[PDB]
Amino acid sequence: GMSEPYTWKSVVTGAGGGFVPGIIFNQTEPNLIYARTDIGGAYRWNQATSSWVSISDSVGWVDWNKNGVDALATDPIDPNKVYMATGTYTNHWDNNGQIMRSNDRGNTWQTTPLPFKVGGNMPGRSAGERLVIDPNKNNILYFGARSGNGLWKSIDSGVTWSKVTSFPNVGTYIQNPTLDYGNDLVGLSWITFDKSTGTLGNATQTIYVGVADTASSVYRSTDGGVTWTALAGQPTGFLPHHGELSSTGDLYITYSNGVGPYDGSKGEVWKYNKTSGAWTNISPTTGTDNWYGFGGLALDAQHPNTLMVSSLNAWWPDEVIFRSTNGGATWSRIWDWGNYPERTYKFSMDITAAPWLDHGTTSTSLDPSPKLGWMMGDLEIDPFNSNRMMYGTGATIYGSNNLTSWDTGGKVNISVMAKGVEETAVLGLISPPTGTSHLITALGDVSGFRHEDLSVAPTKFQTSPSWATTMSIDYAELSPSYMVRVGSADKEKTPSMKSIGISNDGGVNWYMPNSEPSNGTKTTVGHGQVAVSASGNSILWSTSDIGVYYSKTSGNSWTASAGLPAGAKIASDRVNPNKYYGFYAGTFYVSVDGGATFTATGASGFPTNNVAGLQPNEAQISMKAVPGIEGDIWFAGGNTVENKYGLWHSTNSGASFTKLTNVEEADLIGYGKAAPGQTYMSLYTVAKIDGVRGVFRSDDVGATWVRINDDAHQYAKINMAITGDPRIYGRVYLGTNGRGTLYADPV
Ligand SMILES: OC[C@H]1O[C@@H](O[C@H]2[C@@H](OC[C@H]3O[C@@H](O[C@H]4[C@H](O)[C@@H](O)[C@H](O)O[C@@H]4CO[C@H]4OC[C@@H](O)[C@H](O)[C@H]4O)[C@H](O)[C@@H](O)[C@@H]3O)OC[C@@H](O)[C@@H]2O)[C@H](O)[C@@H](O)[C@H]1O
Ligand SMILES: [Cl-]
Question: Which ligand is the nearest neighbour of the Cα of 122?
C-alpha cells in the first residue's frame, strides 16, 4: 500500500457553476461567512483573499452524501464552532443523513448519524436555515427535518439528537406526489430564536418555526420548546421560505406558492409584530402585478428597518430585488421599466471573474446577459457592513460592496463573488494531445469549456449548438482537431437547435450538423454517449432514447446501428477507424464496419449493472481503447452485489479480458503520458486497492499502484470522469459530482 504526495488544484471556472441555496453570516465575528451547496459540500470565506475555501474535501467515497448540505449553523458565542445537517436525498437514492460538528471552522469534522434521511438536493433546499444554535446557550441546537420527521434538538452541542415530540405540525406540502423524486413531505422550513428572550448562559425561551403547510405554517414556543402553538391570524395558502426577526421585534416572512428552487408563481411578504400579534401584508407586488414567489430575505442588522427580498421566480425579463428602508411600508426595485421596452437599472453587473456567464449572447433589455440571477432563494446583507450584499443563484454567488449606493441615487456594483467555488457536475473530460488546450470538459448546466490556462476562467461559452448539459465528448485520436459533443437542445426555445456539436479546430468553434438520429416516428432528444472514429471519418451516437446510430457523413445523415442494444456504452478504437466497441448488460460487443453492425464477443464475468438495490451514483462503467494500440481496451466498473467489480484489460479487441487480481474495486480508467523509461502509458483509476479507496496511478501496466490523492482530497462520489495528459507525465484530471474538475501533479 503506497502513496505519492500530489498537489491538487481546481480547474478554475470563476463562477462555480452550481446552485448556492445558502449563505450564512456569523452574528458575532465580522467577515466569518459560510456557503452551503446542494451536491458540493460547503465553503468558508477568506476575507484576506476574497475567496472561498472548501471545508468538505475530506468527504469520500462511502460517506459521499455528506456533500449534500441541507443546513449550516455558525456559533455566535464560540465562532470557532460550525455545524451541518448533511445527506443528499430523502428518496431511495440515498441512505440516512447526519449532523456534522466542527471546533475549527470546518477544518476537521465529527459526525453523528441520524435515524432518517437529509435532503441537501431535494426541493425546498434554499428555505432555511433549518439548523440553528441557541445564541444565549450554545450547547442547544434545533434541526427542522424532512419527510415528516419533524423537529429535533440537541443539548450537548450536537453530539446527540432527540425528537421534539410536542411539535404539532411535521408538514403537509408535497412537491411531486406522483414522481419518485420529491414525493415525501418537504417538512419544516426554518427556525428562528428570539435572542431577547434569553441571557448569556440561559436557554432562549421564544423560538419561531416555519413549516411547509399552506394551512398553518408559522409556529412559536414561548417556554423554551416545550409547548408550541400556531401564530393566531397568520396568512394561509403559501409556503414561508425564510423567517427573520428584526431587533425592532418584527418577524419578516417571505412566502411562495412552492418551496422552490425552480417554481413559485405567486408570493407574499408579511411582517408579524411579536408584541401586538399584528400581521401586516408588505408584499412588494400583489394581484396581477405579482406572478412569482418571494424567496430570499435579508435584514440589515445595522439598520433594523432596512430589508430586501428577491423574487423566486419572476423569470422575465429578469428577477427583481426589492429594497425597503421603512420596514416594508414602501419598496424600491433594483430595476424599473422606463419607456417600454427600455429599462432603468440601479445595479451594474460585473462578470469579469467569469466572462462565460454571458452565455455568448449580447444583452438586451428584454433578454439581459448576464441576468441578475435566477433561483434566488438566499439573499444576505453583511450584519457588520450594510454595504456588503451576497446572494446565490443557480450558477454562482453574486455580491456587492457598495449596496447603500441604492439609497443615495447611485448604482449597486454587483460582481461574481464565487472565487474558489467549483460546483459543476463533470460528465466527461478529454485531454487533447495537441494544441494550446490540455483539457476540454463536458459539464452539467454550463455545457463545459475548452480550457487553456487552468487557473483562468474561460471567456467563451459553448454555442452553436448552445445547451445546458454536455453528456459526452470525444475526438478523433488521429486528427485531434476533429471533435464531437452531444447534449440535449431546448427546441421549445430554439426549435432549430440540435443536440450534437462538431468542431474542426479543437473545440474553439462548433457547428451544428443538418440532421439527428431518427426512428421515423421521433427524433432523439439527445444525451447518451458519443464516440468518434480514430480518423474522424465516422461518428457513433448511443442516444438516450432511440438507441445507437452512426454517421459516415459528419452528421448530415444518421443510420441505426444493428446488433447493439439501446443504452449501450460505446467507445472507438484509437487506431483502426473501422473499429467500435460496445457494452450492455454484461455483454461486450465489437464492430468492424464503422459502427454499422455489432457482434457480441465471448468476454465473460462483466457486471450487469442491472441490480435492484443500487443508488443512481453507486455503480459505473468506464471503457476506453488505448491511444496508439489497436484493440487494446481497459474496462472499469461493477458493484459488490454481483461480486463483479474491478479493472479488466483486453489486447485482442475485446475477444477476452484479463481481470487484474490486485484491484479489488474500480470505477473509472484513464490514460496519461508514459513514465520516463516506460513505453506504455500511465494508468489513472478511481478504485479500491489494498484496502484503500482513492485515486491511483500505475506506471507498469497495472502491476503496481500508487495513491495520488489523500484523505484531505477525496471529493465524495468520484465516479464521473478521469483522464491523464498525453503530454504531461504524472498529471491527472479528475471529474466530480459537485466539486467541478480537479487537476493534480506530484508536488
Ligand atoms: O425523478 C427524477 C427527476 O429528477 C429531476 O431532476 C432533479 C434531480 O436531479 C438529480 C440530479 O441532481 C444533480 O445536481 C444538480 C442540482 O440538483 C441542481 O441544483 C443544479 O442546478 O445542477 C446539478 C447538476 O445537474 C446537472 O449535471 C448532472 C446531470 O445529471 C444533470 O442532468 C444536470 O442537470 C446531480 O449532479 C445528479 O447526480 C442528480 O442525478 O434532483 C435535484 C433537482 O435539482 C433536479 O431538478 C428531473 O428534473 C426530472 O425530469 C426527473 O428526471
Ligand atoms: Cl443555454
Answer: 1
Same CATH fold assignment for domains 1-16+424-747 and 17-423: yes
* Residue 328 to residue 326: CA distance in whole angstroms: 6
Give the C-alpha separation, 135 to 198, whole Å.
8
Secondary structure class of 288 (helix, strand, coil): helix
Q: Which residue has the cell 481546481?
A: 10
φ, ψ dihedrals at 403, nearest 5°: -60, -40
Q: Whose CA is nearest to atom 42 of ligand 1?
A: 121
**Which amino acid belongs to residue 439?**
L
Question: What CATH code is assigned to 1-16+424-747?
Answer: 2.130.10.10
Give the closest residue to 61 by CA, choosing from 692, 638, 714.
Answer: 714
CB 292 within 8 A of CB 254: no
Q: Which three cell numbers stand for residue 110?
A: 465529527
Any idea of the CA torsion for 564, 568, 571, 572, to the nearest 10 degrees?
20
HEC string of 171-182 equals CCCCCCCCCCCC
- Where do the structural domains in the chain lie, given as residue ranges? 1-16+424-747, 17-423
E-state strands within 68-184? 69-74, 82-86, 98-102, 110-113, 131-133, 141-144, 151-154, 162-163
First to last CA, the chain: 19
Q: Which residues contact 568 (CB under 8 A, 6 or more apart)?
A: 542, 548, 582, 583, 584, 589
Using CB atoms within 10 Å of the CB of residue 692, give its burial: 0 to 12 exposed, 13 to 18 middle, 19+ buried.
middle
SS3 breakdown of the chain: % helix, strand, coil, rounded to 5? 5, 35, 60
- CA pair distance 97, 89, nearest whole angstrom: 9
- Tell me the CB-side half-sphere exposure of residue 592, using CA atoms within 13 A: 8
Question: Ligand 1 centroid to 254 CA: how many Å?
Answer: 26
Q: Which residue has the cell 441555496?
A: 21
Catalytic residue flag (residue 593): no
The length of the chain in residues reads 747
Q: Which of 311, 323, 319 is nearest to 403 (CA)?
A: 323
699 catalytic? Reply is no
Ligand lying closest to the C-alpha of residue 93: 1
CATH architecture of 17-423: 7 Propeller (2.130)
Rounded Cα gap, residues 20 and 395, in angstroms: 8
